[PDB]
């Protein structure tokens, strides 16, 4: 069918590694795939304590788009919190983005503060269990809250139905992350001409034990995506539990937005 | 049936992640498993350019043994170049080590320089293909050769029969490493009373496309292990291609020595 | 007379040792004094090549302020380039800083880039004589210029009127440093609400042979300090040539800002 | 009057800095002076944990002698524990040493174990007060005892009559050190043909509060030096309290043996 360039964007704490099954799957279909580490994530050499906002955290994505050859367009696929990276990138490089794909992901809008969908997430899922929290003071004095995801939360809430090998992989390479929420709160709203004007495709499952059904339904309702795909079964990490199905869906996205 | 504490030691460039399948396998049998990142490896925050020898590279292993409660013993399992870590650790903490297990690994001796088995490896396998090499000057002025493993080498020589997901994983989290060969060359020999006196179990396959058959046969011959297990099929990364079989071998090791 | 807690911050290449005379002088007057080594300076175990920006270099000062008990205030005294550390710290911990004291020091502002005063310094003093320069590539790929201060420069320009013992001391413990100037150039400006709102006291002499009179006069003009003290005679290192006089000035600072 | 090349060797924990007054003093008289940092001392980039014996600790001295032009001779001056460096160096490079000078120093012999004078020191001065002790396991599994000298011991026992500036200096740059005593104990004795044949000059004061009078008298008795100079007053650190007098004595050593 149509071939495309997917850019895969992991969530906070995680890394490009999270896409290790989906990347080859897509490449079996002849697509070009780039999986990037965001700052202080995966094997990026920076530590979270030197990162000051979610925009700074997004730097590898923005640098990648900047260097993207003119006339090429990419499809940016984002899991969980990475919808925020998609929104940010789209406000700087709208013309390089054929579509944005949201995979059990935060779905930001242009009408509320950037932090809105984060507030709502925490409203629906306030207890992160054995997760530990730390703080540091960023370069203009704002207290930033970082987290180290608890293994029980990993096992039961994120990687629920993943194999033991995958869960174990997650513990071996997980890093600290931050929502940068108090900094997001002060951030200008995402623009209609950038983020608002990209095609948006929302993939999810009702079996997600952290991005819960009412919350995801609420997101779809708050800000209508061009297409919604619901996948049966699986867990929060569909790129692991439902790899082939997600690949196929991404093909249809390519077919549509080209 | 005996239970044991296995400490899993990855090779240069790699990380604890390489054990993501074998760790849970062993845990299914009731064992305790620790997989460590060596310095500037996996997600360790240090960069290779601040590390000055193979002993310094080994620090997380040595720190772990140092803090191991008096009277506890571990079985150290090492892949590829990690036999050097095993030798180094054993010279410092012989009484904390029930056995050393060598998995398609360098098998050092006490009669030659510590660099010997490295020289012989490079003799048998001199061409590392699309691997790139870099250089830095360490804190006492020795030029250190670091490497970035080439993807073709990864695909064909290291992860030969691994799934695409594993191979792709490897590219997403591989780091630079170094043999520290010129520093190994000037290093005192491994002692009989430490490394020489631990139990040594050598597991390998003849299908290994970088640690080649004549080389591994030579290593067995140069320095006789207490027991040799040969696994049919698989590739250099048997902890991925032959996980269950390696688990079951490690149980026999535990039975014998734990 | 008012007592205070002075935190003494040395310049690049140097170390806490530089304050070996001024520290006990102040303590004779009943003050608390902390003299910190910045990263890769004095006897700090880190090497300059693992430090990536002037913010990272400032870490010990920021960690010290972070751990300072709520409601305690310090007076930060900085020589030469340490004004940058003062500016950085003040943007993060304004409420913990009673005043900032600048001793023949860079005096940054809020309207220009952080690098501005550095550019102007090099403008006025472009020839650093027998100083040697090196480079390394930092963790995000920027070339960093490091320097090893030449002994002639030490003798004639920095420690001009210091005893031969002090000069000789300097050669025995000096390390590499960096202005991190290209990284400063990209750095966000120092904020009004932090650095801009601290009390600023500028102490200097016209006998300084590296921070030259026109340059220091220009700094005072560019960014008016709350108080300016000029000390007659001495050299660049007034904490050595004019110890008692600097102590007495710092007392007036304590008396004022308390 | 004769000129000479003096090589100044500090004690454990300390560094070349300790000679910052004596070096220029001697240079006044036209001598050549080299003050070296031993391993993991002063600003040497190595940490004490990578150092495995007192021979390894001595490496900069031995490297210096090795590179000393054939036919040149030096006078090695050693304070406190540095007598051990003198003994070690002399057994390698006897023909490059005009004399050894011992300044309130350990005075080793050829009849007893290298550790003998250390045992006796600790016999006479067993309580090191607020000194902290740490431990690490060296390359062949020996536990090594390192120390961080306590400030009270510094003030009252080492730097007793030094100025406050000097004492303060010491706190700003002191590092960890080790006697390596258990390793010295296992070491081959110093040879008669090397160490035993060099000229030996012993300079001391009875006002030393750590190398006590009975102990120094005992050393002189145990192994007779060619000349003994006793300096009135001062403290353990005569290169600070009695600089000029020590310089003048070192002239006579030059006159005799250079």
Question: Can you describe this structure?
Answer:
Chains A, B, C, D: Pfam families: Abhydrolase_1. Four copies of one chain form a homotetramer. Chain A has 258 residues and is an alpha/beta fold. Chain A is 34% helix and 18% strand. Chain A contains eleven helices and nine strands. Chain A has helices at 22-28, 54-57, 59-67, 83-90, 116-124, 151-158, 164-173, 181-185, 213-222, 238-241, 243-257, and strands at residues 5-9, 32-36, 74-79, 97-103, 132-137, 143-148, 177-178, 200-204, 227-230. In chain A, a hairpin with a 5-residue loop joins strand 5 (132-137) and strand 6 (143-148). The longest helix of chain A has 15 residues, at 243-257. Chain A binds chain B through residues 15-17, 19-21, 23-24, 28, 35, 42-43, 45, 47, 164-169, 172-173, 175, and chain B through 15-17, 19-21, 23-24, 35, 42-43, 45, 47, 164-169, 172-175.
Search tags:
homotetramer, 258 residues, alpha/beta, Rossmann fold, 6-stranded parallel β-sheet, 3-stranded antiparallel β-sheet, AB_hydrolase_1 (chains A, B, C, D), aliphatic (S)-hydroxynitrile lyase activity (chains A, B, C, D), EC 4.1.2.47 (chains A, B, C, D), (S)-hydroxynitrile lyase (chains A, B, C, D), lyase (chains A, B, C, D)
Question: From N to C, what is the helix and strand string of chain A?
Answer: EHEHHEHEHEEHHEHEHEHH
* CATH topology assignment of chain A: Rossmann fold
CATH architecture of chain A: 3-Layer(aba) Sandwich
* Protein chains sharing the most extensive interface: A-B, 23 and 23 residues
């Amino acid at each position: 069918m149509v071939t495309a360039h997917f850019v895969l964007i992991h969530t906070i704490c995680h890394g490009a590694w999270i896409w290790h099954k989906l990347k080859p799957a897509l490449e079996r279909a002849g697509h070009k795939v780039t999986a990037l580490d965001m700052a202080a994530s995966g094997i990026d050499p920076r530590q979270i304590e030197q990162i000051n906002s979610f925009d700074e955290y997004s730097e590898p994505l923005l640098t990648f788009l900047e260097k993207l050859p003119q006339g090429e367009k990419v499809i940016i696929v984002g899991e969980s919190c990475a919808g925020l990276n998609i929104a940010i990138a789209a406000d700087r490089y709208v013309d390089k983005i054929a579509a944005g794909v949201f995979l059990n992901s935060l779905l930001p809008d242009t009408v509320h503060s950037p932090s809105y969908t984060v507030e709502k997430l925490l409203e629906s899922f306030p207890d992160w269990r054995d997760t530990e929290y730390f703080t540091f003071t960023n370069i203009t004095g704002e207290t930033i809250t970082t987290m180290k995801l608890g293994f029980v939360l990993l096992r039961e809430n994120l990687f629920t139905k993943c194999t033991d090998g995958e869960y174990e992989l997650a513990k071996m390479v997980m890093r600290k992350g931050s929502l940068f929420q108090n900094v997001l709160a002060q951030r200008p709203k995402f623009t209609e001409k950038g983020y608002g004007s990209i095609k948006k495709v929302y993939i999810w499952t009702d079996q997600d034990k952290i991005f819960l059904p009412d919350f995801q339904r609420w997101q779809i309702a708050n800000y209508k995506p061009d297409k919604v795909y619901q996948v049966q079964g699986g867990d929060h990490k569909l790129q692991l539990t439902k790899t082939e199905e997600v690949a196929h869906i991404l093909q249809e996205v390519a077919d549509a937005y080209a």
